[PDB]
Structure 1
């Protein structure tokens, strides 16, 4: 779509991350309601246009598992990324309201994430690079979609508490789409237990549900300690095994997207009848 600053009317604020703010907006010429992300950057015209050009690939993304893109442009010190408005927000904010997300929901999320990453790899040769609950969006039609993947290397460079980065990435060695699987595994543990799971919950913390760690200490924990795991009574063995295969520290032994698609947890989840829309609407108070 052709998009420019004066096309838009602000409706409300959707949220803010470290270096961006997202607004629900009306696109007057089309009538479309969008989510417009504004990334404030101080960069010269050559860099701005390289970011915008790199983002044009997003017009080619078309999947039920990937948030739709309408367009990108630069205005007043900010790159705008206009995308599909997801009325359920992110799984991060869903997690806050829900406390914990149950296994059968997380099964539908797992399927959507695997298929989204498969689509990005197979059709666009893109790894995601930033899988985490805040980058998985949901809506009241019960859809689950990935956003904020690294289509633009220049946007990544111009922008550079919780870390979702795999051991291999944190140690500065080789990484691939396998590092996204790690991020998914960790995201799933977080949502399953209701807390970012590094360091592991002990005895009395698991009891209640069923000092914080500095960034350098956290990173060295991820690289050197055994991977997080689900508690073993409350979740099915298939779910525990699924998460375990995602969180293998050696990326060559960690399951890949093709193996996950065929995992027992995934086969079972795919056959289950889960009214996700109904669950979502009542947990966050939508219509």
Structure 2
């Protein structure tokens, strides 16, 4: 597929990552010194750590799990598939190990944090920036589907990471069933209405469209905002009530007058409740909003650094 091709810069960065990764070796707990806490999420705290032997800076997620030694070795073996997932739109993976009652997952460090964290800083994210985000998520989901036959299963702003180089990558896509089972939990407020009713990449496309709306307006779009909140933005529901709303009510949408019709049509085709009518990855890759965004020269790194205060 032409959408899986890489630039010369993307190919250079991918080779540089694998070249530095070959120098690492087997990860052990005592080889890490904590630098700072990057944040909490999905049953474990993520630390910015330094791998003392190699000197690299990594993100280390520690998941406290008390399981028999066999159960742990299965999770570690199932996470080894991440070594083969190499793409400019997938967060780089270093290794996983068990130590002192905690599963560690060491990955590439993204100094921009997640888009959940960026959204809290920005308030809302502009459409041109979200065009670059849409392109990366589509290509990331396409890479996982095409080269590995893998669904993400948990697309949301907190699982989309960015950095000061202008890169946008996905992470935390389901690869180990024994890890999800042993942790039984994550939010279901981004799941498609068909998954909430009892499973395809179409579900991930719903989650992308839902995440794009939240970042565009600056709030989780369900329940829909009233006209008073709109005039304050552009000029409580329990979780079980929220999931019932997703299944039994029409999908959310962008407000009129403030976003282009191509952007509105893009999220509309992502949020069609019928997965058969909902657009797939091939159709979205050639949507008018995506083709327009790909030709737009947007300085994402410059916008990101000034928005969150990186300097």
Shift of 1:159: 1.6
Taking structure 2 as the reference length, what is the TM-score of the superposition? 0.90
Q: Which runs of 5+ in 1 are unaligned?
A: none
Shift of 1:162: 6.4
Shift of 1:29: 1.5
Shifted more, 11-20 versus 111-120: the winner is: 11-20
Quote the residue 1:245 is aligned against: 269
Instruction: Check whether the contact 1:91–1:137 (CA below 8 A) recurs between aligned residues.
Output: yes
User: RMSD of the TM alignment (CA)?
Assistant: 1.6
- What are the superposed Cα offsets for residues 191-238 of structure 1, whole Å, 9 maximum, x if unpaired? 000000000001111111019110110010000000000001100000
Q: Are 1:229 and 2:253 matched, yes or no?
A: yes
Quote the residue 2:223 is aligned against: 199
Instruction: Check whether the contact 1:9–1:26 (CA below 8 A) recurs between aligned residues.
Output: yes
- What are the superposed Cα offsets for residues 24-51 of structure 1, whole Å, 9 maximum, x if unpaired? 0110121110000111112111211111
Distance 1:209 1:127 in 2: 34
1:218/1:242 CA distance change after superposition, 3 Å: same
Q: Are 1:166 and 2:187 matched, yes or no?
A: no
Instruction: Check whether the contact 1:90–1:137 (CA below 8 A) recurs between aligned residues.
Output: yes
Instruction: Check whether the contact 1:137–1:144 (CA below 8 A) recurs between aligned residues.
Output: yes
Shift of 1:129: 0.9
Distance 1:189 1:139 in 2: 22
Distance 1:209 1:25 in 2: 38
Distance 1:221 1:42 in 2: 36
Distance 2:255 2:169 in 1: 27
Q: Are 1:81 and 2:111 matched, yes or no?
A: no
Instruction: Check whether the contact 1:88–1:280 (CA below 8 A) recurs between aligned residues.
Output: yes
Q: Secondary structure at the match of 1:31?
A: coil
Distance 1:91 1:162 in 2: 18
1:101 to 110, 125, 131: 125
Runs (4+) of structure 1 exceeding 4 A deviation are none
Tell me the number of residue pairs that the alignment of Structure 1 and Structure 2 aligns: 284
2:290 to 266, 277, 285: 266
Shifted more, 139-148 versus 209-218: the winner is: 209-218
Shift of 1:155: 1.1
Taking structure 1 as the reference length, what is the TM-score of the superposition? 0.97
Distance 1:41 1:264 in 2: 46
Shift of 1:123: 0.9
Distance 2:142 2:188 in 1: 25
Instruction: Check whether the contact 1:162–1:196 (CA below 8 A) recurs between aligned residues.
Output: no
Instruction: Check whether the contact 1:15–1:21 (CA below 8 A) recurs between aligned residues.
Output: yes
